[PDB]
From a paper:
The [name]-[name]-2 [name] is the major surface antigen of the virus. Its function is to bind the host receptor ACE2 and mediate the subsequent membrane fusion required for cell entry. Here we have examined the structures and receptor-binding properties of spikes of the B.1.1.7 variant first described in Kent, United Kingdom (now termed Alpha)10,16–19 and the B.1.351 variant first described in South Africa (now termed Beta).
This is in contrast to our earlier study, under the same conditions, that showed 83% of Wuhan spike particles were in the closed form. Again, solution equilibria cannot be extracted from these data but we interpret this near-complete switch in states as indicative of the open form of the Beta variant being more stable than the open form of Wuhan. In Wuhan, Lysine at residue 417 on the [name] not only makes an aliphatic packing interaction with Tyr-369 of the neighbouring subunit, it also forms a salt bridge/hydrogen bond network with Glu-406 and Arg-403 of the [name] and with Ser-373 of the neighbouring [name] that stabilises the closed conformation. In contrast, the substitution of an asparagine at position 417 in Beta removes an intramolecular salt bridge and would generate a steric clash with Tyr-369 of the neighbouring [name] leading to destabilisation of the closed form and thus promotion of the open form. In the same way that G614 is a prerequisite for realising tighter receptor binding by the substitution N501Y described above, it may also enable spike protein from the Beta virus to achieve an open conformation as a result of the K417N substitution. In the Beta variant spike, the presence of a new substitution, K417N (also observed in the Omicron variant), in combination with the D614G, stabilises a more open spike trimer, a conformation required for receptor binding.
Author numbering:
A (entry chain B): 714 to 828, 852 to 940, 944 to 1146
B (entry chain A): 566 to 620, 641 to 676, 689 to 713
C (entry chain A): 961 to 1146
Write the structure that this text describes.
């Protein structure tokens, strides 16, 4: 049986969306020329499909963020008073002094990630939601969680002190509420220390988002570099061929260049769709994780951080989202002799809620996740059956507190 | 003279022996906003990346938007322009461009001895 | 698009294959036929790849629908915001052309009132905690009630359990506990 506990804080990194890219078929393939455009026209439509695919990808990229973050009906604002039962929500809540409405951890996150081609017909669209709105959304979620609990998600937000909210979470995971109220200072100090450790470790990781950015950067660079290959033509510059050869000869040279560039563009588009599918799956997982761990408690194991889950707070990262799970893990232990049932007068006495333990001389009944021995009484136990059916049963007595009263 | 993309961008004059630069002319995509063809025939062209110094006028981070007025207020998004701007038709009617509104803001009276 | 792609020259002299067959000697028409072969093969490959990519997403959506059907319909789920907004009660399925439509019945509260609370009440120097509810006071008296509905009830020795003494509790107030056994004893 554990006799203590430690509060742990973890982090998880989940990419949400990527860059919205636009590519022009005609300017890339041919450019300023008109003979090349006329030749390309004979290929039916190998531009409309590419434009449609890229526009669909961009719309999906916007939808991922809209689904992940826009989960709150009203933008709550934290009250000025900071009497959160001893807890320190100052490295997470926004600081208006900074030019942006971000917080310390968010600022460390954006400073950690570091993010010509436009002349070739490759352009990058801007995100639909600028980072200020995302910061406002996350601040609203934090304020709702802190000042209301999980009630704000279900309906209208309901105020409640933070101490009783933490007591509700404790009672949810299987530890009676008196444990929190008796050990409030220790838990507050442990949580503050965990937040401090997270902040210190982050300053001095973010591999997922960096790799997501690097993949697109390398893909665009490869697409740009593919424009220099001859593909079997005499020269890789269309103007050079046009000014140096007759149209009847220049046509057959331009055909090979057109085929090569069209093939490269097809490859790039296919890779982009394959990557966007995976990003969509990750964004859906992130939305589910937010809606489950943040807006309420979770009974799923290992879903929201290792250990038993208490509460979580979201943070915003460039092209991603960060969760700070707060968990409850057991601590220093002790051996204990145990027994299934207690035999009193030919009647078994199963424990109503808890276990039967004994250090070697006296028997006690106590909860599973914390150690607080109590005397066996009629309120802790219920009788059922005889003393022969149970495989292992230990003789002892039961207090029955009614007898002293009648004296 | 070349660059990372390996395209001729700097040339030396064969006559005067001086250094020049090469830069392709400005270009970008064109996007149109329409409130539908059942209420009006009005539109509002949006140039993708051209600065408004080049070829009503409302310079945005997303690009130049002409044909639509700009207002102080903030309503729910109707047309996803980009960079936190959304246009709409309802203002005798004209297109307007504004900033997104996240939603109504409320503050809950949180005190250490109060419940709901 | 796949059908309309059949009407392009692809570099040959004509689009329909019959004209190529009739107008030219096959030893010269072989290259003209080869051009169309290449173009149409490329178009078919593009269409097939797009279809596979779309089928993956439809499969994922169908798996999600199956999970929601198995969890919301065949029982009650405690996963927040999964089986509809609000607390979840029960769901019914309906059919649709190439899809499924659910009807989530949800329980949502309204018309809230505010109150004053205390973490615990101590009567004779020992702190009492609520077993399953929360202590609320309307201004003169203290009652214990469940945390999702307002049904005040007089605080007794059956709504509370003692734990230690009322000095460690950061917030504590004075009150009385009914102790129903004593009045019946007399
Ligand atoms: C449970 O563990 C905590 C540590 O988190 C113990 O609290 C520390 O106790 C030592 C010894 O008295 C003090 O020096 C520390 O200041 C305490 N706090 C911390 C944060 O270390 C606590 O004593 C343990 N429980 C029991 C019953 O001993
Ligand atoms: C097992 O725990 C019980 C707790 O009740 C211990 O009982 C105590 O024993 C000492 C020594 O005889 C008495 O002075 C105390 O009054 C007893 N009660 C309490 C609450 O301390 C018992 O000693 C423990 N077993 C062993 C082997 O130490
Ligand atoms: C809080 O609720 C109690 C419920 O008992 C109210 O006390 C009752 O008030 C009415 C009207 O004055 C009396 O007729 C009853 O006899 C009272 N019950 C008692 C004293 O047990 C109390 O007034 C309420 N507080 C308010 C409304 O401020
Ligand atoms: C919270 O911690 C910061 C430093 O981490 C400190 O400056 C601030 O005073 C603390 N707040 C409270 C209420 O103790
Ligand atoms: C419990 O008993 C086992 C068996 O001897 C021992 O290995 C273990 O260390 C004991 N627990 C503690 C906390 O000492
Ligand atoms: C319990 O007591 C009964 C009667 O006193 C006896 O028959 C039985 O063997 C005892 N069991 C143990 C484990 O002492
Ligand atoms: C145009 O759209 C509006 C919007 O509902 C509709 O009321 C109207 O009947 C439509 N007109 C035609 C000709 O379809
Ligand atoms: C457009 O050009 C003007 C004039 O130089 C400049 O002040 C402005 O910043 C430019 N627009 C952008 C978005 O930089
Ligand atoms: C916003 O308000 C300011 C202050 O009067 C005004 O100068 C500006 O023109 C307004 N923006 C509009 C009308 O788009
Ligand atoms: C909270 O309750 C007090 C009385 O207990 C009342 O004066 C105040 O107006 C209430 N605040 C609300 C309902 O926001
Ligand atoms: C609640 O906060 C007030 C300050 O507004 C303070 O006087 C009071 O002691 C606090 N009570 C508890 C139980 O935290
Ligand atoms: C009422 O509560 C106060 C708070 O400490 C305490 O000092 C006082 O003794 C309590 N009343 C009685 C009758 O014990």
């Amino acid at each position: 049986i554990p006799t203590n506990f430690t509060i742990s804080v973890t982090t998880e990194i989940l990419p949400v969306s990527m860059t919205k890219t636009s590519v022009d078929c005609t300017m890339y393939i041919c450019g300023d020329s008109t003979e090349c455009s006329n030749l390309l026209l004979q290929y039916g439509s190998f531009c409309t499909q590419l434009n449609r695919a890229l526009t669909g990808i961009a719309v999906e990229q916007d939808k991922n963020t809209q689904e992940v973050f826009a989960q709150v009906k009203q933008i709550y604002k934290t009250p000025p008073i900071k009497d959160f039962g001893g807890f320190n929500f100052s490295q997470i809540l926004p600081d208006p002094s900074k030019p942006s409405k971000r917080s310390f951890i968010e600022d460390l996150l954006f400073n950690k990630v570091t993010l010509a081609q436009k002349f070739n017909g490759l352009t990058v669209l801007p995100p639909l939601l600028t980072d200020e709105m995302i910061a406002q959304y996350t601040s609203a979620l934090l304020a709702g969680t802190i000042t209301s609990g999980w009630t704000f998600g279900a309906g209208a937000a309901l105020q409640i002190p933070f101490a009783m909210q933490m007591a509700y979470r404790f009672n949810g995971i299987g530890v009676t509420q008196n444990v929190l109220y008796e050990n409030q200072k220790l838990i507050a100090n442990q949580f503050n220390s965990a937040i401090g450790k997270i902040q210190d470790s982050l300053s001095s990781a973010l591999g997922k988002l960096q790799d997501v950015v690097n993949q697109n950067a390398q893909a665009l660079n490869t697409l740009v570099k593919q424009l220099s290959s001859n593909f079997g033509a005499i020269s890789s510059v269309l103007n050079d061929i046009l000014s140096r050869l007759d149209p009847p000869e220049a046509e057959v040279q331009i055909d090979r260049l057109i085929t090569g560039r069209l093939q490269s563009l097809q490859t790039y588009v296919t890779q982009q769709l394959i990557r966007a599918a995976e990003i969509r799956a990750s964004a859906n997982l992130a939305a589910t994780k937010m809606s489950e761990c943040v807006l309420g408690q979770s009974k799923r194991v290992d879903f929201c951080g290792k250990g038993y889950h208490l509460m979580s707070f979201p943070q915003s990262a460039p092209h991603g989202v960060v969760f700070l799970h707060v968990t409850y893990v057991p601590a220093q232990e002790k051996n204990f002799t145990t027994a299934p049932a207690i035999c009193h007068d030919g009647k078994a006495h199963f424990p109503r809620e808890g276990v039967f333990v004994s250090n070697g001389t006296h028997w006690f009944v106590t909860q599973r996740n914390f150690y607080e021995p109590q005397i066996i009484t009629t309120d802790n136990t219920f009788v059922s059956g005889n003393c022969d059916v149970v495989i292992g049963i230990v003789n002892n007595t039961v207090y029955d507190p009614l007898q002293p009263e009648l004296d | 003279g070349r660059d990372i993309a390996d395209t001729t961008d700097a040339v030396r004059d064969p006559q005067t022996l001086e250094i020049l630069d090469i830069t392709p002319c400005s270009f970008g995509g064109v996007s149109v906003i329409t409130p539908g063809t059942n209420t009006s025939n009005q539109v509002a062209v949006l140039y993708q990346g051209v600065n408004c110094t080049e070829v009503n006028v409302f310079q945005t981070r997303a690009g130049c938007l002409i044909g639509a007025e700009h207002v102080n207020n903030s309503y729910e998004c109707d047309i996803p322009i980009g960079a936190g701007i959304c246009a709409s038709y309802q203002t005798s009617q004209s297109i307007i461009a504004y900033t997104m509104s996240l939603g109504v803001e409320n503050s809950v009276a949180y005190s250490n001895n109060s419940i709901a």
